[PDB]
Write a protein that binds this DNA or RNA. Structure first.
Ligand SMILES: [K+]
Ligand SMILES: [K+]
Ligand SMILES: [K+]
Ligand SMILES: [K+]
Ligand SMILES: [K+]
Ligand SMILES: [K+]
Ligand SMILES: [K+]
Ligand SMILES: [K+]
Ligand SMILES: [K+]
Ligand SMILES: [Mg+2]
Ligand SMILES: [Mg+2]
Ligand SMILES: [Mg+2]
Ligand SMILES: [Mg+2]
Ligand SMILES: [Mg+2]
Ligand SMILES: [Mg+2]
Ligand SMILES: [Mg+2]
Ligand SMILES: [Mg+2]
Ligand SMILES: [Mg+2]
Ligand SMILES: [Mg+2]
Ligand SMILES: [Mg+2]
Ligand SMILES: [Mg+2]
Ligand SMILES: [Mg+2]
Ligand SMILES: [Mg+2]
Ligand SMILES: [Mg+2]
Ligand SMILES: [Mg+2]
Ligand SMILES: [Mg+2]
Ligand SMILES: [Mg+2]
Ligand SMILES: [Mg+2]
Lengths: 82, 101, 206, 99, 151, 127
RNA sequence: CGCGAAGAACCUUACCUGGUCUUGACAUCCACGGAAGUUUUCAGAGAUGAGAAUGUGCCUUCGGGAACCGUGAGACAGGUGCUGCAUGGCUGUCGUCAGCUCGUGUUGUGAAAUGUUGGGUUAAGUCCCGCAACGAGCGCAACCCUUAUCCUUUGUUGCCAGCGGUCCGGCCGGGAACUCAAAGGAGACUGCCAGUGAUAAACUGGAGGAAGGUGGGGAUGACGUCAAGUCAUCAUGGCCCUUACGACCAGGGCUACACACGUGCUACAAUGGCGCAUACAAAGAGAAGCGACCUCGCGAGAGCAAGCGGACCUCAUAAAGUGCGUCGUAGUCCGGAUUGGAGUCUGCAACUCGACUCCAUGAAGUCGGAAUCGCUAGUAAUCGUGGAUCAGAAUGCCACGGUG
């Protein structure tokens, strides 16, 4: 776990989220920053997170706050062995 | 070892000694415990990403000088485990000799 | 079986290092690197000078290089026209003022590095390896060596299957630490590949 | 007032020559030399894989031996300290001067 | 060894009693190089034995020991396609080591609380010809009589 | 006067000073029982002075460093023996006959390459 | 099969998805234009594109070159692409086993033999005898390092016997005795004695001695064998790609999980668990480093900050042990896996995927089938400590000491 001396979100996405809040809800905001945490300003937005080869869409709700963006986009596919 | 890799390492070293080792204040004396818990700290944290992904000294793999071998490095000589033995044996390394005890 | 290399098994018993400077952990890695570059450069452009040993000393500040060659005229040149060219070009490779000596080997038939590269040169000119091999052995033995063995290996005479032929004669006690055994290796680059040459020369005890 | 100087070399034969030479050089200048003192020698040790590939179990062990000596001059008259600056110390030894 | 005629490493006697037999016993009982713990177990159990069996501290140890020493063992020898248990007489020094080893191994497989209490009870009933240690001796002798034809 | 002796063991080195008097034993400014909590160490230290029965006739001043308790007890016995030599020099044979003169030259063997210990090799499997 | 890898979050990275470049990320050659470097804004995930400040360094023997940047076109670059059955170099293995050969002579039509066999002896083709063989070489042994005893020299940062002082601390004066440091020597040779043995070689035993028969350990790997391994350390013959099999970037992956095997660690308890007190090491490392004392925190750690390129300071309080108390044979006051919560630290960044801390939870496990592995003495077993790699990240590897 990181420190209580600041959470971590990247600039290139912090600009996009704060630019997209006032202009309403639109097509999902496409990103690669799996490592940026989720802020209360994000609630209700739809973000397409990278998973190596696609941008899976996640709709942010109130309960997914404080979690990193990545953990709503699994990178491995597994359906059984037989 | 694929000259492209050698080129990457020299670029990373040159990029590290230009930005950081002087622009390491903003990761030390603003990420410090004080009353700057306002945007003073937050903006430094945000600024540190804008710098190039390199120049971070934690990104140089410390390859061998004569071959660029990424594994089996020895800091005292700067060579890999292969070239040290080869050069030790002809007598290029002062002092060094087979140890038995 | 793999043999221990014969030179450094004797370093500090009967043989001296080729570099005799002192340095702490800070610059040890960087003296070795400069020493590599100067040796790489000298052997690259003294190819026909028959240089057999390049010892490097690093006094308080400067660097001094001693060259052991069998044809000092070519490296000295007229009145020292080109040894100064060496000094000026060494000084910036090492980044420190340089001073080049030139030492001397009397009998090239009794130095392993000179024998080895002589054989490679003939092989690279398509000489029957038996002639080169059997000739170096007899030349060295009639000048007073107490023993010698040479060894070549790898696609000899343009064969399709690599072999290993070694001609030994005299006395070469590799297991005795008192023995003064001069050994050195060289490679020849044939149109059919590469051929390694190894030489052992035994000069006497203690 | 006293000068204290250390000698580091990679071999004991060369450090002996330089030590016995510096020590007598000062004694000529009339001062009294305290030493020499053989300090413990630092022996580094290295182990390296000798195959280019696998066979971890076949290694080779090397070492660097650093010999060390100490001499103290306790009445450095104003002809000794300078004189020491012009001695033919070897190449494989280095000196450390302390006042 | 095929040729070596081995000597014999010396053993220091007991500190308390000066016995060359209890030094072996402590060595047999000790584990993982903890000599002090073994001496504590042997001493405490020995003195408990002394006061239970009257007096005579270390010859109370001898009287139980003499009740468990084997006199003939069996050696398995393969003949030509069958094997026989040829019974062979035991050497003097081997008699003690066998007697001590059996007592200690039996003094481990009990339900008592401590190791001192565990060992003292074995040392007692062995002097009284009871216990797994003396049974081991009976079994070995019984096995070695059934093959007396091969002696 | 005082007579001196150096004895040593696994990794310890003891120096022992013997003086005529009554039985007094001091190890590193402490009494014999205060130092050696292990009772066999006490028996080892006293052994030479019970063989040559000068146990109540000598002061012993002893300084010990290095090693562990059993090594220190071993060194002291060797140091005592050598000093007790320097006292009489005529009671050598019987001190030799008990194995006290011999300086036990056993040392921990160095770990070797490929072995988990001095001699313990890893497990070997055919398949 | 804890192997390359002495350490995969990014990098490493060679693989995948997408976005990008084509004389190129690395080098030489020409032409041309700009001294370089800067210090900043936008777009972009970033590569990269745009743009605004910026400087004009030196000889000019006043034409350029310096060095650096950018553009053009081709010689070429580049390849962790294939072939270890085309090769070099390096390594494993039989095996630290005692063998493997040659010159000359002789025997045989010849391949070949002899020597090198035989009687003894040895760790040994080690040695002595005999002998159509006479000699020699590579191997064995010795020469090298370390350990075990003693002696000479030097005495700080190491030491303290005799002295005096003392705050009881070698801490002060002081001493060079002792431990110790590290240079130079002495010592061990079947050398001496007795017996056996072919008037032999060598064997047993004894003395003396720190050590006795190769004192202990290490380095040292003969001719060759496996077309053994490595074309991904490197070098290299042939073949292949050159708008891509080359180059740059972000994210992922190498950490998947029905299963099977190899090597380890922790346990199943009382020779033990827990709590308090308390002894005794060795070898190492340290400058973008080791970090003391003190204050804060239950803790990991935080704040301030001395000392040290080190026999001086720091890492760093050894643990088994020992004394007292408690538990009382129970899936337990054994076991500490898993999971929830809350944290610290490194690092642009710990979701995939770090280490550690505190609270809580308390799986399997009650000594393990057929079978199988290591070890002959300071060895096995057991207890801790250090180092390399390394921003962080060992139960692995390499070394050190304690009990034994
Ligand atoms: K090869
Ligand atoms: K012949
Ligand atoms: K190739
Ligand atoms: K990844
Ligand atoms: K297992
Ligand atoms: K493990
Ligand atoms: K992580
Ligand atoms: K429990
Ligand atoms: K680390
Ligand atoms: Mg790294
Ligand atoms: Mg150990
Ligand atoms: Mg294996
Ligand atoms: Mg292994
Ligand atoms: Mg990447
Ligand atoms: Mg990666
Ligand atoms: Mg033969
Ligand atoms: Mg024959
Ligand atoms: Mg021989
Ligand atoms: Mg013969
Ligand atoms: Mg040998
Ligand atoms: Mg003295
Ligand atoms: Mg093959
Ligand atoms: Mg390949
Ligand atoms: Mg892997
Ligand atoms: Mg610490
Ligand atoms: Mg139970
Ligand atoms: Mg344990
Ligand atoms: Mg460790």
């Amino acid at each position: 776990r990181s420190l209580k001396k600041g959470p971590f979100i990247d600039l290139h996405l912090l600009k996009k989220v704060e630019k997209a809040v006032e202009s309403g809800d639109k097509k999902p905001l496409r990103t690669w920053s799996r490592r940026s945490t989720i802020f209360p300003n994000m609630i209700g937005l739809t973000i397409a997170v990278h998973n190596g080869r696609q941008h899976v869409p996640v709709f942010v709700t109130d309960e997914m706050v404080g979690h990193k963006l990545g953990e709503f986009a699994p990178t491995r596919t597994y359906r059984g062995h037989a | 070892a694929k000259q492209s890799m050698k080129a990457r390492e020299v670029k990373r070293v040159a990029l590290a000694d230009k930005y950081f080792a002087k622009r390491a204040e903003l990761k030390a004396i603003i990420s410090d415990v004080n009353a700057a818990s306002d945007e003073d700290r937050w903006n430094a944290v945000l600024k540190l990403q804008t710098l190039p992904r390199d120049s971070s000294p934690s990104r140089q793999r410390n390859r061998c000088r004569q071959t660029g071998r990424p594994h089996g490095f020895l800091r005292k000589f700067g060579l890999s485990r292969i070239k040290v033995r080869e050069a030790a044996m002809r007598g290029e390394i002062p002092g060094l000799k087979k140890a038995s005890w | 079986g793999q043999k221990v290399h014969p030179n450094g098994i004797r370093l500090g018993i009967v043989k001296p290092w080729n570099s005799t400077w002192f340095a702490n952990t800070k610059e040890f890695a960087d003296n070795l690197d400069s020493d590599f570059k100067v040796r790489q450069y000298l052997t690259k452009e003294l190819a026909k000078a028959s240089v057999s040993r390049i010892v490097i000393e690093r006094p308080a500040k400067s660097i001094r290089v001693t060259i052991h060659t069998a044809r000092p005229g070519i490296v000295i040149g007229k009145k020292g026209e080109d040894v100064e060219k060496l000094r000026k070009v060494v000084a910036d490779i090492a980044g420190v003022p340089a001073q080049i000596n030139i030492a001397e080997v009397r009998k090239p038939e009794l130095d392993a590095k000179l024998v080895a590269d002589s054989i490679t040169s003939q092989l690279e000119r398509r000489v029957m390896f038996r002639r080169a091999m059997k000739r170096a052995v007899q030349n060295a033995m009639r000048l007073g060596a107490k023993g010698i063995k040479v060894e070549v290996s790898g696609r000899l005479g343009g064969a399709e299957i690599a072999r290993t032929e070694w001609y030994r004669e005299g006395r070469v006690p590799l297991h005795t630490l008192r023995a003064d055994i001069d050994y050195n290796t060289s490679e020849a680059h044939t149109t059919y590949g590469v051929i390694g040459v190894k030489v052992w020369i035994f000069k006497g005890e203690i | 007032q006293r000068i204290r100087i250390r000698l580091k070399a990679f071999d004991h034969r060369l450090i002996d020559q330089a030590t016995a030479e510096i020590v007598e050089t000062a004694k000529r200048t009339g001062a009294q030399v305290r030493g020499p003192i053989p300090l413990p020698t630092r022996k580094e040790r290295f182990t390296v894989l000798i195959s280019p590939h696998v066979n971890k179990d076949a290694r080779d062990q090397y070492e660097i031996r650093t010999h060390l000596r100490l001499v103290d001059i306790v009445e450095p008259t104003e002809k000794t300290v300078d004189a020491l600056m012009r001695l033919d110390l070897a190449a494989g030894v280095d000196v450390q001067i302390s006042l | 060894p095929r040729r070596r005629v081995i000597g014999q490493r010396k053993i220091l006697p007991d500190p308390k009693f000066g016995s060359e037999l209890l030094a072996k016993f402590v060595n047999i009982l000790m584990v993982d190089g903890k000599k002090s713990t073994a001496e504590s177990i042997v001493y405490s159990a020995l003195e408990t034995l002394a006061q239970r069996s009257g007096k005579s501290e270390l010859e109370a140890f001898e009287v139980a020991l003499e009740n468990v020493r084997p006199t003939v063992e069996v050696k398995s020898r393969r003949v030509g396609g069958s094997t026989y248990q040829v019974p062979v007489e035991v050497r003097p020094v081997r008699r003690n080591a066998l007697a001590m080893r059996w007592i200690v191994e039996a003094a481990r497989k009990r339900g008592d609380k401590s190791m001192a209490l565990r060992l003292a009870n074995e040392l007692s009933d062995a002097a009284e010809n009871k216990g797994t240690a003396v049974k081991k001796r009976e079994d070995v002798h019984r096995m070695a009589e059934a093959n007396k034809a091969f002696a | 006067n005082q007579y001196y002796g150096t004895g040593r063991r696994k990794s310890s080195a003891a120096r022992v000073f013997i003086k005529p008097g009554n039985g007094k034993i001091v190890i590193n400014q402490r009494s014999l029982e205060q130092y050696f909590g292990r009772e066999t160490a006490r028996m080892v230290v006293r052994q030479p002075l019970e063989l040559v029965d000068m146990v109540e006739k000598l002061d012993l001043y002893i300084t010990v460093k290095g090693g562990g308790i059993s090594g220190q007890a071993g060194a002291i016995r060797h140091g005592i023996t050598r000093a007790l030599m320097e006292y009489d020099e005529s009671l050598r044979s019987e001190l030799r006959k008990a194995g006290f003169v011999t300086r036990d030259a056993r040392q921990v063997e160095r770990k070797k390459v490929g072995l988990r210990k001095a001699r313990r090799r890893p497990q070997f499997s055919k398949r």
